[PDB]
Design a protein around this ligand. Structure first.
Ligand code: FAD
Length: 525
């Protein structure tokens, strides 16, 4: 019988399988639905870290195919449609298909988690785990940083910036923003070279860092790939195993503990199908109630995104080609919309230029939003995806933040070092930079068209989180305790981005690594 069965070998599941199997006495099985990515056969679309958008251009090969979501909140006069939402289906999960940035957020995010009932998940409580995961090439010997962890984190050198980047930084300085250098240990507003994870030009997923060739030969560690968990097995109020599809065979596997790391959209669907969820929703589908947990699938967080693109004028194109560090990430911007003063540093922006597509871009997102959504089962079948409603821009502050970021963009591009390029900025969906949207200067004058455009075209940043949140022992909307244990049953934990009480002011991979390290420590102690 396995001591731990870990469902989903993504970012979190990779950490948990490594840390829990480090004790020889723990017999650990990690199950992952997608392909393996062993060192001798990492697919090339995955392996190319300098082109980390590559997986998104190979259609659904590396993702949960036809996983569709509703994005923006329903609103009068707009007909929304289901949208494909990319989630990794392969060892390493999101870390195998992501944009390779590695950032922590801000102390306030985690102090918030503790204020909302996650005891010991304040900044002081999470920092050691941010330190444990990382090996920072630039600042690793400094306080607040790690120099020994499995996940490399580095930045491009300022001196290697393209003339286009330099020009954008001058525009930001004219707007009063300074270079803060280290977004992971300096927490006021400003711009910086983004921290990212790469091994030279190679992607370096959680699978490569936590499931390395030595880990894989641990005799107490079993790894099943192309293996899909269908259902949790139960005995009374204990979870006691899983049922697994491996090819055309179904297998039962006993476990002392099952840890769900199936991703923020799919972990809570497993919980619902197991009968852990809002009792009225479960009755509605004839699913026996094991525990009435009204928080399951609620509290769905995301980062709300939009793009701006312009054709590259000759000067801009030339300026864009002078960088000395290839197509790595060059520039990120942390800023305050001022919409709700209770939430500083609520915007993340990037300005860059791509000679290949021939476009300059200013993409950004609401990095600390106010809206949340939810997901529910469509039906009881184990193969169905959940019905997901991100409900973006349901809180009007988020709409105000989108408009403010667009005005910021206008301001930066009005500064001399950017205005000299003569770029004609137009709107675009965030993840599809392309022609077709209106001019930014024209749209901003038309309040009703602006709002309609934003509610129609708002996107996410793959930051799905919060659907099985940590919370206090007496809180009926909490799903798991401070160690990931699912309230109402035994033998079951959740330990992926589902457990975040709120989305951080951060892309979610590094906070996921951190939370997985913290949960693993809690289990082990
Ligand atoms: C396209 C994309 C770009 C991104 N860009 C970045 C970025 O640059 N930086 C950043 O910090 N974050 C970014 N993110 C987000 C970040 O990578 C995710 O938040 C993180 O991977 C979440 O980790 P996780 O363990 O919760 O889920 P995942 O890594 O998604 O892992 C869940 C795993 O569970 C498996 N699984 C699910 N159901 C079953 C089942 N029934 N049986 C067996 N296995 C199952 C999956 O196949 C998957 O491998 C991006 C994500 C995407 C998708």
């Amino acid at each position: 019988i396995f001591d731990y069965v870990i469902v989903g070998g993504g970012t979190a599941g990779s950490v948990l399988a490594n840390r829990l199997s480090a004790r020889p006495e723990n017999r650990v099985l990690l199950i992952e639905a997608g392909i393996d990515t062993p060192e001798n056969n990492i697919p090339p679309e995955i392996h190319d870290g300098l082109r980390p958008w590559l997986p998104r251009l190979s259609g659904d090969k590396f993702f949960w195919p036809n996983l569709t979501i509703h994005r923006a909140a329903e609103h009068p006069g707009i007909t929304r449609e289901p949208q494909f939402y990319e989630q990794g289906r392969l060892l390493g999960g999101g870390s195998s298909v992501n944009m390779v940035v590695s950032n922590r957020g801000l102390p306030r995010d985690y102090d918030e988690w503790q204020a909302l009932g996650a005891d010991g998940w304040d900044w002081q409580g999470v920092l050691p785990y941010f330190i444990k995961t990382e090996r920072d090439a630039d600042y690793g010997d400094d306080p607040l940083h790690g120099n020994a962890g499995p996940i490399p984190i580095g930045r491009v050198d300022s001196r290697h910036w393209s003339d286009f980047t330099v020009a954008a930084t001058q525009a930001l300085e004219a707007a009063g923003l300074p270079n803060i250098h280290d977004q992971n240990a300096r927490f006021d507003d400003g711009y910086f070279p983004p921290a990212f994870t790469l091994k030279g030009e190679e992607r370096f997923s959680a699978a490569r860092g936590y499931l390395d060739a030595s880990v894989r030969v641990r005799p107490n560690l079993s790894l099943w790939t192309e293996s899909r968990v269908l259902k949790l097995l139960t005995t009374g109020n204990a979870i006691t195993g899983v049922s697994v599809l491996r090819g055309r065979e179904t297998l039962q596997v006993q476990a002392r503990e099952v840890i769900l790391t199936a991703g923020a959209l799919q972990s809570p669907a497993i919980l619902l199908r197991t009968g852990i969820g809002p009792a009225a929703d479960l009755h509605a589908l004839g699913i026996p109630v094991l525990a009435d947990r009204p928080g399951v699938g609620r509290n769905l967080w995301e980062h709300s995104s939009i793009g701006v693109v312009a054709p590259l004028t000759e000067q801009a194109r030339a300026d864009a080609s002078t960088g000395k560090a290839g197509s790595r990430h060059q520039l990120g911007i942390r800023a305050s919309s001022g919409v709700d003063p209770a939430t500083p540093s609520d915007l993340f922006l990037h300005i860059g230029a791509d000679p290949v597509s021939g476009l300059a871009s200013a993409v950004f997102w609401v990095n600390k939003p106010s809206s949340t959504g939810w997901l529910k089962l469509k039906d009881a079948d184990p193969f169905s995806y959940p019905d997901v409603d991100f409900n973006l821009l349901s809180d009007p502050r988020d709409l105000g933040r989108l408009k403010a970021g667009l005005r910021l963009i206008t301001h930066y591009f009005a500064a001399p070092s950017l205005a000299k390029y003569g770029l004609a900025l137009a709107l675009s969906r965030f993840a599809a930079p392309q022609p077709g949207g209106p001019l930014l200067n024209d749209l901003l004058q038309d309040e009703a068209a602006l709002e309609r455009y934003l509610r129609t075209n708002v996107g996410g940043v793959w930051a799905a989180s919060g659907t099985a949140r940590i919370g206090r022992a007496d809180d009926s909307q909490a799903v798991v305790d401070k160690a990931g244990r699912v309230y109402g049953v035994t033998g079951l934990r959740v330990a992926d981005a589902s457990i975040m009480p709120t989305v951080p002011t951060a892309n979610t991979n590094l906070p996921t690594l951190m939370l997985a390290e913290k949960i693993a420590d809690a289990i082990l102690t």
